[PDB]
Amino acid sequence: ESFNLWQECATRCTLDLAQGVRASQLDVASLLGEQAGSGVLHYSMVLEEGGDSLKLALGNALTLRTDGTTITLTSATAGKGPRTYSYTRQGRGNWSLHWLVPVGDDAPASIKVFFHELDAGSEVSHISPIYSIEVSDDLLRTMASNSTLFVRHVENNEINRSLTLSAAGVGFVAAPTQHSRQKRWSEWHTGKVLCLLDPLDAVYNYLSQRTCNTWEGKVYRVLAGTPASHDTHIVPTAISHRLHFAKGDGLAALTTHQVCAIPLESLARSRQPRGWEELSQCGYPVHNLVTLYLLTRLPWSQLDTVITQALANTTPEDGSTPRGQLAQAIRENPAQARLALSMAAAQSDAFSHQQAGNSQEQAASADVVNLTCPAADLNCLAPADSADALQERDYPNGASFLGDGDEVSFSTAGTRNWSVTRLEQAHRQLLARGYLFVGYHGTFLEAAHSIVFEGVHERDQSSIAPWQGFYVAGDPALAYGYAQDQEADARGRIRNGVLLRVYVPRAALPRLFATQQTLAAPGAVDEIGRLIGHPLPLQLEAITGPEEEGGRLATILGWRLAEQAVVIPSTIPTDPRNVGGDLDPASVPQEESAISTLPDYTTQP
Ligand code: NA
């Protein structure tokens, strides 16, 4: 009842399933060798006739069930119990089974499984989410050395009990022998995991309309069989990447990733537990604030009262209680408490609107769906099967536009390695890649780091409804007033902040509106609502208008547009010795003024 998948099915095999179960050994341990090092195994095969009524076991307690309607994946985990993922087939006929298994002592503690539905031409017509599972330690070792593929027909109305496989094979990509582990595996929990395998590059490129510019010099070495590289002409669509966490700290992990610009794989399960030593300065404090808030079971709606009372420190607190520990954590770093808790609150809110029963409790331990948003498209639709997950939209960020030079970083003493020359180069690159400047954002140092090195993310602004959005000023003097801490840190000092330059995609230009009314006036809500063709809050639109009557101009980017903005540093410094003082007009370099022409905004007739 055995077979050789990689010898018989490398081209095309028809297996008899009439007498029950068929099994093949997937021995990669021999083919790899003693020390082929750290990297990624890519197993793949095409399932043809018989592939719509099957039970496959890719290992002990990893099962695939295909009934023609769904393809379901049941796995044992390193966590509390097994998990089930279910893909609704969008098409009919042949499909590609892919699974990625990392190799090495310091390699990620998850596998990838995903399905590509094929048309008559053997091109990809539909893709599943990339399912990322923190499997049992047993599966991590087994699926990387010697694993057994069991195949059983499951009874339906089909008279015949056979399975035709083609293009069965396993490739191995060796990780470039350089770089920290953090950097090596940084794309593991993004759309760009597909970029690590030559045979899946074209799929990432075509769907996203974005280049794979990971691991320069890598070689896709076929170990056995003949893996297929399928072309696709699918209309641009979002690549979904579902991330399971054995620890169940999805919301804490995503917020930590977004606040600290730490790759989400470094906050996943570790094979060799290492503690928080490598991530002690932003990682631990941010993760601890969100964990502690959730343990109090306070609603996110009460965030403003919780922070106000913690900073006042007038009320008597029990330092032993979760409520008291949260309050100490907030005093210990007010800046990142505001940034982190407000970002977690907005994510919990968006999650609760996705479907019924998406409570605060469920958001805390939900999976994360990462979405690779197609370039040259202002709409990034998540697939319906992601309603039960925390959703992160990956768009290009400021970090990818900084050009060549030493590491840009933020401090009270000024922005490091950010010359008038480097900004000019970055600006030209942004204009050439279809962006335009809409003004200045002033903020505190930790917010600047998040916005540039990770990207703009929605923060809870429920108190100012319906005027939620990313606030920008054409005049840097207005932004400057906000480029500082809102209150004293634990050491009792208020720090100067950072001025940032905000760029939106050129396609948004039609929906950048202006008005001569004050942006929180009586009739203004309804007058702006008619101007943008729907009620506030703003979506894929901006509004520019006087902040006060006779005041300077404020620009509000709707959060759905703001997330697609690219933000880079200004060369306009904040004054470390005049914190609360006005911008010195003499400190604005002529070379930055010259590239800061605002676009012509659309007004009411
Ligand atoms: Na992200």
Author numbering: 15 to 227, 231 to 622
Passage from the reporting paper:
Members of the diphthamide-specific class of mono-ADP-ribosyl transferases (mART), which include the diphtheria toxin (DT), Pseudomonas exotoxin A (PE) and Vibrio cholerae cholix (Chx), are potent bacterial toxins that specifically modify the diphthamide residue of eukaryotic ribosomal elongation factor 2 (eEF2), which plays an essential role in protein synthesis. These toxins catalyse the transfer of ADP-ribose from nicotinamide adenine dinucleotide (NAD+) onto the diphthamide, which results in inhibition of protein synthesis and thus death of the host eukaryotic cells. Among the many virulence factors produced by Aeromonas, a Pseudomonas exotoxin A homologue, AE, was shown to be expressed and play a key role in the virulence of Aeromonas hydrophila strains causing necrotising fasciitis, likely by causing tissue damage. The tri-domain crystal structure provides strong evidence that AE is a fourth member of this toxin family.
The crystal structure of AE was solved at 2.3 Å and presents a three-domain fold similar to other diphthamide-specific mART toxins. Recombinant AE produced here was a catalytically inactive mutant E571A, corresponding to residues 13–626 of the full-length toxin. AE crystallised in the P1211 space group with two identical molecules per asymmetric unit (rmsd of 0.62Å over 601 Cα atoms). Overall, the structure of AE presents a tri-domain architecture similar to PE and cholix with root-mean-square deviation (rmsd) of 2.5 and 2.9 Å, respectively, and includes 4 strictly conserved disulphide bridges. Importantly, this domain holds a furin protease recognition site identical to the one in PE, corresponding to sequence RQPR, with the scissile bond between R291 and G292. On the other side, a deep negatively charged cavity formed between domains II and III leads to a central interdomain interface and reveals a potential metal binding site. No strong anomalous signal was observed for the metal ion in the electron density map, and without any obvious metal source from the crystallisation conditions, structure refinement showed a Na+ ion was the best fit. The bound ion presents a tetrahedral coordination mediated by residues from the three different domains: E409 (domain Ib), H274 (domain II), E471 (domain III) and a water molecule stabilised by D411. It should be noted that although AE was crystallised at pH 5.5, it presents an overall fold similar to the structures of PE and Cholix, which were solved at pH 7.5–8.0.
